[PDB]
From a paper:
Recently, we reported that the ferrous iron and 2-oxoglutarate (2OG) dependent oxygenase γ-butyrobetaine hydroxylase (BBOX) can accept substrates other than γ-butyrobetaine (GBB), and in some cases catalyzes unusual oxidative rearrangements. BBOX catalyzes the final hydroxylation step, the C3 hydroxylation of GBB, in the biosynthesis of carnitine, which is required for the transport of fatty acids into mitochondria. The catalytic cycle of 2OG-dependent hydroxylases involves a step in which hydrogen abstraction from the substrate is followed by hydroxylation.
NMR analysis of the reaction product resulting from the incubation of N,N-dimethyl-piperidine-4-carboxylic acid with BBOX revealed the formation of a single alcohol product: 3-hydroxy-N,N-dimethyl-piperidine-4-carboxylic acid (2). The active-site residues in the BBOX 1 NOG NiII complex are positioned similarly to those in the BBOX GBB NOG ZnII complex. At the active site, the piperidine ring of N,N-dimethyl-piperidine-4-carboxylic acid (1) is bound in a chair conformation, with its carboxylate group in the equatorial position. Kinetic analysis revealed a KM value of 40 μm and a kcat value of 0.14 μm s−1 when using 1 as the BBOX substrate, compared to values of 4 μm and 0.83 μm s−1 for GBB. The results for the BBOX-catalyzed oxidation of N,N-dimethyl-piperidine-4-carboxylic acid demonstrate the potential of BBOX for the desymmetrization of cyclic achiral compounds to produce a product with two stereocenters.
Numbering used by the authors:
A (entry chain A), B (entry chain A): 0 to 384
Amino acid sequence: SMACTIQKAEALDGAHLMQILWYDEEESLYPAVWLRDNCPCSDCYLDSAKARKLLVEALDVNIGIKGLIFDRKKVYITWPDEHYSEFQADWLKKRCFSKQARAKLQRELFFPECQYWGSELQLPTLDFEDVLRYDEHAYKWLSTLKKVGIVRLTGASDKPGEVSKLGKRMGFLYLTFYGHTWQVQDKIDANNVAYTTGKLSFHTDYPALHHPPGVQLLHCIKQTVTGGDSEIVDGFNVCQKLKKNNPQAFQILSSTFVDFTDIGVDYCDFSVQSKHKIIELDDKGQVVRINFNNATRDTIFDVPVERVQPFYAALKEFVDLMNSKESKFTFKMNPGDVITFDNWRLLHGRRSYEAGTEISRHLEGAYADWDVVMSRLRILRQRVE
Amino acid sequence: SMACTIQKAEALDGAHLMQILWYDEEESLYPAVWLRDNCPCSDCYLDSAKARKLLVEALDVNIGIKGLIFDRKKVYITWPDEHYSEFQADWLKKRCFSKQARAKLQRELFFPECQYWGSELQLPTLDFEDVLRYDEHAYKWLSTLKKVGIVRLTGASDKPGEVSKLGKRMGFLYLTFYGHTWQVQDKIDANNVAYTTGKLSFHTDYPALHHPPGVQLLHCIKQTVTGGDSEIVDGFNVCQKLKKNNPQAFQILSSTFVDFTDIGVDYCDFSVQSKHKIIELDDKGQVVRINFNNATRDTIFDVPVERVQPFYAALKEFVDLMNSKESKFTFKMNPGDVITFDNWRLLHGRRSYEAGTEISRHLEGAYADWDVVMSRLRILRQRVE
Ligand SMILES: C[N+]1(C)CCC(C(=O)O)CC1
Ligand SMILES: C[N+]1(C)CCC(C(=O)O)CC1
Ligand SMILES: O=C(O)CNC(=O)C(=O)O
Ligand SMILES: O=C(O)CNC(=O)C(=O)O
Ligand code: NI
Ligand code: NI
Ligand SMILES: [Zn+2]
Ligand SMILES: [Zn+2]
């Protein structure tokens, strides 16, 4: 393309910069030190690993270009210490430091597109076996999971082992103290409120961990008619509404460290403690994770006394917003249904149901790391494209 | 004790607070809403899970105490809606909201004690089998690992499978794309610079992940005489020196998001991307993690052009400080040695060695999550005490 063809290349600014004039008449600037740092020759770069061999120690941060020649597709550079580098035009173009270029590349790397939703949610639904079998369907699955925060898979069996197949489709599951997979059912001497018939209000799973699970998989094996409906809410949407309606509540929940705890025995014996802000913001002030499970929020609360009641007042507002008819989406899982969702963004709940002699309700669940999911998503996109 | 015995209990401030006068004449304040939130009765609290059943929805954030009686060891409270609660004196005392009380409890939960070191490091060393066999030794191991950031274990075998035993002693290992465990040796078509004979400058492992491994285990199976010495540095100590010597460099490295990448095939196929600040600060400005591997730092660099060379200048200063004779500690692993260290705090390196026809050097490594390690540490402390 004209955009990726070199019309002129030259060293500028004490030879500390290279400028490319492209044939579309746009110009790009590349710091000399970055070029040297990213020399792709076999001394500096290990092709089989696609990784840098060059040490920081070898880099003169005040380096300038000693010599430069070019043709339409390549730049050829000599450095002051006689090192020699070649850079490809398309490789340079992609890495252009302009905001527009960098932003475009970031979107391609990290799939930032996000669709907020409330009670109007149309639950994205795909077939289980299709997803396992076809890359086009697995791509739709993971891309939708990232964008919308949840996908329902229908047509799985009513037997354990289904979430493990999805785990393999992704890469591998995220092991925790509750196992590689775990059975959500009523249990004698339950080590977790999830393993009872009680109502679960909106929560994220495992805030007791510093790194809570990114993605949750829940497969319905048995369902009861006496209750047990699922409820979800878009935590990012709720946070936006909270900041608007009650900035003071938002400020408290996005700045106060809450202690979470989990003690007991399952995969092995554990005694787990963490601290999270319930609304976790990035350095730009955007919400990147919600960390909230009212069951595992500790009795220990590490704040001064005067901050305690305002925190609870803020928390109540947040929960009231989640429960709003405009915010929450309700549905009931059937045997063979699997839901897969963003556990950093969505909060989920379940309605109480009745206990009985034998098991009337059974889900099998598992977790996955977002980096594992994003890796598979990147690869799938490449295969389908 | 006099400290944990109740002399007087009363409701204050519109009954929105409870005050305890202890027999040591100290006073403690407990917000009414926190008391109600943390009622330990069987309606509100699930004993078998040690978890809260009470919903945020059930909590009146403006609640006050309706009635209160007490004896030396318990408080008995009635609430406005006729709910009834009992709280134990020692339980209350521990959770006192005074800064001194909260801080003491936080130290007990999270083991914050930290000993910074440089080239004067005395490498903490324990016997491998002792650690597996005796809780007192496993406690010394993990507590020292947390405090100092590294422990050497001697007297393991010269065969694979040793780091897996330590993994079980902790609880379980942290699975990544390179496997449950992995073999550090020279490999044809290496997918990582670690799997070559090249020099590795100081780095943390796996900054290409959003959640890099907290603890690293490295077991020497075979060692070469031609090089391959290990080097470590206390990243937290180095960061302190950098902030002092070059606050501008510290500011850049603690504020600039660097892209990391890892693409290839090992446990399965992967295409991994992340962003980290090299010096990662908490909300108080204290360093909590270093994220830096020069091999996996991407060619993609998502900053404006004018920030590029100053970043490299800052990075060079940081690396130069790490390499200072006062900072780094050098040693050579022997067959049967295992080092276990804090991969969020320490940076580690290895000297190049010579390639040859058969394998002259072989380490087996694995990772563990700090939450898994801290859990085991908490349990061990309880067993030994
Ligand atoms: C599967 N299981 C029990 C893991 C821990 C979650 C939590 O307690 O936050 C609930 C669900
Ligand atoms: C074991 N292995 C290969 C995992 C990835 C680390 C990294 O590339 O940061 C190097 C060490
Ligand atoms: O039982 C359900 O429907 C939901 N269960 C959970 O969210 C859980 O295990 O924490
Ligand atoms: O080979 C060594 O001694 C150290 N290896 C590593 O730090 C690695 O695998 O990244
Ligand atoms: Ni849950
Ligand atoms: Ni390493
Ligand atoms: Zn080169
Ligand atoms: Zn109660």
